[PDB]
Curated annotation (Swiss-Prot), chains A, E, G:
Source organism per UniProt: Methanothermobacter thermautotrophicus (strain ATCC 29096 / DSM 1053 / JCM 10044 / NBRC 100330 / Delta H) (Methanobacterium thermoautotrophicum)
Name of the molecule in the record: Putative snRNP Sm-like protein
Domain of life: Archaea
Keywords: Ribonucleoprotein
Domain Sm: 5-73
GO BP: any one term: mRNA splicing, via spliceosome
Record carries keyword NADP: no
GO (cellular component) term, any one: Sm-like protein family complex
Keyword Membrane among UniProt keywords: no
Family designation: Belongs to the snRNP Sm proteins family.
UniProtKB/Swiss-Prot annotation, chain F:
Residue stretches making up the Sm domain: 2-70
SMART domains documented for this protein: Sm
Protein name, as recorded: Putative snRNP Sm-like protein
One BP term from GO: mRNA splicing, via spliceosome
GO cellular component: ribonucleoprotein complex; Sm-like protein family complex
Family designation: Belongs to the snRNP Sm proteins family.
Keyword Ribonucleoprotein recorded: yes
Origin species: Methanothermobacter thermautotrophicus (strain ATCC 29096 / DSM 1053 / JCM 10044 / NBRC 100330 / Delta H) (Methanobacterium thermoautotrophicum)
């Protein structure tokens, strides 16, 4: 990560498990497969959670960047 | 399967098949994806609308504005 | 019927036809689509505002700002 | 009354005439439309605010920011 | 007030008392001193209101245009 | 014709920043840009007019600002 | 700091501990690694707090700027 490119953190995490925190306390965990500059992204083998609890399991999911709070490899 | 710099390709890969569209505020649609643009505006055919996870109605065609979408799953 | 990369063609296909509009905050309109732009600003004629299957207001013509739209169903 | 691709021309058609403006949070204003821009910022003269079919406030001239507007009608 | 320039209503109101209604129902009243195309504006001898009663007095205040619902001279 | 000059006039002097959701900051204005992103020093955060947090320096995003009062 | 460049406050804290406050009252503490003009930023050894106590450890997190209220560098 260059001191001027935060998104290089996403690049560094391609093909690896990440945690996505959305607004409203929704959370996703899965393998990062693709992303654009808007932080739209695709995860494979995804889990949607609540209270540290799986509420849905998704083989692949496209998440719109505008609803993201943070991404944590 | 999806180019690493094109997440919207996930939409293209699923054209004319059933998808799940989670919208803000616990609304969701399930129906056949017919079209989409780079804003994630999209058209479904033969879609059920759900609210709180209960079906409220079925719509023959529906255009969803992308700014309301949270995620999409095939 | 709709080009796969042009979802707004669903609106083009429905000029002079009845449509349903669902707004953020859940307000709903039914009326005849007369005009629209790429922002989804639109004009309806013979418009009805609904709330429980009940028409709460009729307007002969109305201009709806696209930014507040959830979806549009022709 | 409006080009099928120019919904905002509905505003031009209402210039110098009474209109009804519905805002977010259910506020309603009625007055004479004096000017407007592509953002739907607009000026009314002799404006009144309505709640439950009644004037809760007489505003005279008022400039309404477009971003808060739900719909406009004659 | 020219038909394609709503901002002229502000120009007409310079140095005159105005009422500014904000998102969230907060209201401000004061003398309009300055504004820009974004509707950022400066009032002098401002008062903040909650149900027609002054809740707060300010001598000078710059209000961000993005939070404004209406301005009424 | 330029309200942003009100900020210029107040550099290096105490200001009050009111944010959305009722949060409020007081501190010395050090820097700002056209977006109203701004830096304060000796910043105090207030609630009910009470000071609940002290920050030697804070960068506040403009999009959250309701008003600024010198 | 340049009176016309508030983000120079971020530059000044590259590789230093910072405090990030988000909308809806989330707060993070960590080492600032990079940031862009939108205030998207990356923290290392990040922690999530609540009422002054740590409630969550992350080893690297990318935070979207649109959700930031303030940063205390």
């Amino acid at each position: 990560v260059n001191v001027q490119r935060p998104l290089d953190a996403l690049g560094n995490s391609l093909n690896s498990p990440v945690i996505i925190k959305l607004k409203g306390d929704r959370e996703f965990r899965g393998v990062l497969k693709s992303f654009d500059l808007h932080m739209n992204l695709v995860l494979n083998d995804a889990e949607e959670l609540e209270d540290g609890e799986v509420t849905r399991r998704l083989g692949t999911v496209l998440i719109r960047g505008d609803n993201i709070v943070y991404i944590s490899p």
